[model samples]
Target chain A: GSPLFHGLAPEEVDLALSYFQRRLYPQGKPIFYQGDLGQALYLVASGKVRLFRTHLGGQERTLALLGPGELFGEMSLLDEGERSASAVAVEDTELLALFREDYLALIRRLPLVAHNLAALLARRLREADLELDLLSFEEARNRVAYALLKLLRQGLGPLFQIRHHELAALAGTSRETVSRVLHALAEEGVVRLGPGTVEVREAALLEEIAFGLA
Target chain B: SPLFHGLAPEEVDLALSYFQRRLYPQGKPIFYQGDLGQALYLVASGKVRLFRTHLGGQERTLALLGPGELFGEMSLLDEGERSASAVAVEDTELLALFREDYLALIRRLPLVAHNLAALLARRLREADLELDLLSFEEARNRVAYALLKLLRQGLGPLFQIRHHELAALAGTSRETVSRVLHALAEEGVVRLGPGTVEVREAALLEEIAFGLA
Candidate 1:
């Protein structure tokens, strides 16, 4: 559930919802780009969106995936700066946007929003710390395993609607490398690969791979 | 000025009174990762480094903090284990406010809570940048960024640090750190001395750090 509406009364939730502008994004759509002026924070209503960054070397890294009820592009709410990363629609998605001006006005009347925002940032920071640790030290194969396990735990289902390139970005490796890793995992009956999807056959074994037990 | 920046003199004095003073010698760990934390630390003097050690003994220096900086607040907020280990980089003087006192202080001073939220936001932004940098940037870029960040944290020019320490901060090897600093010196971007480096042209470093040059 989105923390934005947490602890809010019905009227307050309705009032907060009124300030949000609902918009649609088709699959493969670029919602925003890195370096663009961030004007609003978006909450996913349906489908999925991926937050990623393009490196100076022109390589892309997928930072995280946002499913329905999750929020993205929220850094601007605090920093008033350009977007730190980009967001794209992984599938046809709907989002509710609250502009910076609206957010500022809303928080004046709702202190819970401020408290919730702080909690959200703290949780995200913890996730970032873990992700940074994984990227900096873990091997590529382990990163791939870890990423898959992370997505599964996020309740995104065992049939992961992901691409090799997307998995590569998430794992901080190359697409070719992900392909090879996936091939080996499939051979071990750890996963089943289909067109643009991966199904976990044995989550216990996948967890073992993620933590380097196998 | 960082932690108590906007508070009145009396308010600052009152806030400081809640904290107990602690001393840590150089190389002493104040807290380790996974340790249940009980207090948040304010740097009164000397330097501290936040880092994580990997299974292979490889260290990743998260941040190098100096006097006036605040650290370990995340644990207080979440009541969780320390995310990173904190060690005294020098004979460090710290003001530690235990979890109970910090909670009480925040209830008494709402402004302090607001200030802390702002600080957490800034830290989160830096964490995001670090994620990208560590993931995609070159060793040279990371090293340059680390040096610039240390200077920003009040280390000033010609600060004391070892090659291996810089290597940990840059997420690179000690040899790479040495070569990069040597190249920067040769390019007149820095002046390397024994156990220290003076940033001569910080603009050049900025360029290399962000991959502009």
Candidate 2:
């Protein structure tokens, strides 16, 4: 049903879901702070959540926008460290929270959990590797294109809510640059920009923009 | 004992029994890129450098690991090909835990596997953070942040490092790192020596590292 279910059985997932404590958040509520002690892992059952970090100057950079069926907070659960990033609800959100001790017990009692986590962590390492590679491009517009296409590939689909500043933060570009690049893409009919969202039109052309050396 | 603290004492000893102890001289390659990986290594003593050749043919140093740290474990658990090259940065002692025994131990004490999983996750997060630093707008901040990461990762005060290695770590050029190294030295936050740099003021460097964010 989800990436989290990759190595788990239906019945096992059924039991696992029940083991988690469900909590709801109003739109824009803080899920956790960066410095908070990480004592639990969370599963996004519904709605959207954003992961972010703050600069010393109080500027926030969005790291990720997580949606349903995604697992968050495992970084803390696995590492036994303070939270390295903060999470906040993008909209009305519901999360299934699993305490650290419970997750540890789940791993000890069930071999599937450990295997699933280990394998996914391996994939995540590869994901970060790809992200690092994408950043090596010489052009800001290329990075913006790559970042958008990446979000598109993650199944964020044809239309998704994205802030210009957030995109700039993740791409290490300025909002002005993100605006310029997206507008250029729009002129080429590759994307249609909205007040707060973007719709991919010419997906192939957008892909080419990222690698096309234009 | 440090790594095995989470497992039962007997289980730890049993896993220890499975490890094949080995020693390497300074600069000996522990593993090479694309090697058929069959074992994970634990640094029983001494230090090791993890590196890879870049697209431009430069040897990019990723990390310098000291005693009590683990390396090459990813290849054992995941795929079989070595992803990076590892060499002894100094005369080193290591314990090679074969994949068969390592996985077998995991099956026995899930707790041991749990700790390893956690450790790898933390390492992965740090790797991502390194990427974030390199993506920063300012090359000076990138170098500073990477140096802080190295200091945080390895020993403190003074360590043997070079401009090329720092460049590789920061994903910048050697000339850029050399330039920033002198600037940092001038600021009294670090002192450049014959073949090493001493972090004279870590908090000051951290302050600068954050300011550019």
User: Among these predicted structures, which one has the highest TM-score?
Assistant: 2
* Candidate 2 chain A, run of 10 with poorest lDDT: A130-139
Query: Mind giving the per-residue lDDT tens digits that candidate 1 earns over A66-104?
Result: 998898877765567788888999999999998988876
Model 1 misplaced stretches (Cα beyond 4 Å): A4-28, A105-112, A135-214, B2-28, B89-92, B97-118, B124-130, B133-213
| TM-scores of the candidates, chain A only | 0.61, 0.61
Candidate 2 residue pairs that clash: none
Query: Top lDDT: which candidate number?
Result: 1
Q: Candidate 2 regions off by >4 Å?
A: A133-214, B20-27, B45-47, B89-93, B137-213
Best by DockQ: 2
Task: Give lDDT tens digits, candidate 2, residues B99-124.
Answer: 77876777777776777778778877
Query: What are the Cα lDDT values of the candidates?
Result: 0.78, 0.75
Tens digits of lDDT, candidate 1, B161-196: 899999898787676688778878898988988898
TM-score of each model's chain B: 0.60, 0.59
lDDT of 1: 0.78
- Candidate 1 chain B lowest-lDDT run of ten: B52-61
